[PDB]
Amino acid sequence: MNLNQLDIIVSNVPQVCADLEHILDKKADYANDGFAQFTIGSHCLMLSQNHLVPLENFQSGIIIHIEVEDVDQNYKRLNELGIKVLHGPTVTDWGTESLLVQGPAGLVLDFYRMK
């Protein structure tokens, strides 16, 4: 088993997509009026307007953690962009440094690194 892909269901894929590109500092691999695909290392993240099965648009309640080499450089980048930083870089006693940012459409992202 391999958790490979996460879809977020949203009504306005182009805007959510555009916002996610600035936050992630990479373009979508591919995007439509109703679908966008990002590759983030070994994992894909889709935005979809269509309901593949019966469900509602995404509201809240997740954190998408992205392991990065330099948390503080992402921080600076994001601050210059005007992105809402929810928790500035902090570290655990075990060396886990993280940065929590408000993403579009209720999404919350963590850019983090470990010991």
Next chain:
Amino acid sequence: MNLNQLDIIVSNVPQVCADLEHILDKKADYANDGFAQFTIGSHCLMLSQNHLVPLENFQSGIIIHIEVEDVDQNYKRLNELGIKVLHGPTVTDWGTESLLVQGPAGLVLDFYRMK
């Protein structure tokens, strides 16, 4: 960058965890009353009661896709367990076989295999 951990914010971690252990046919790596950890190949899935930052408990609007060697087997196992199947095994013209299931707490899972 590497997307490798997803947190779901839920209210009754032990029961959401137990429900997920049955669906995934694997035990949490670790679980307490407010937190649980799954490893699903090379990516982790946490359940969390606590709000690391401000947000609502998860409601709806994501599909978690789990790539598997045998979709039809997972199907018989899930039918046996009595888990709600949203779309029985189907296949695209490019060989992508998928099975969509209702998970706990509004979660939707897809066990899928590609050509």
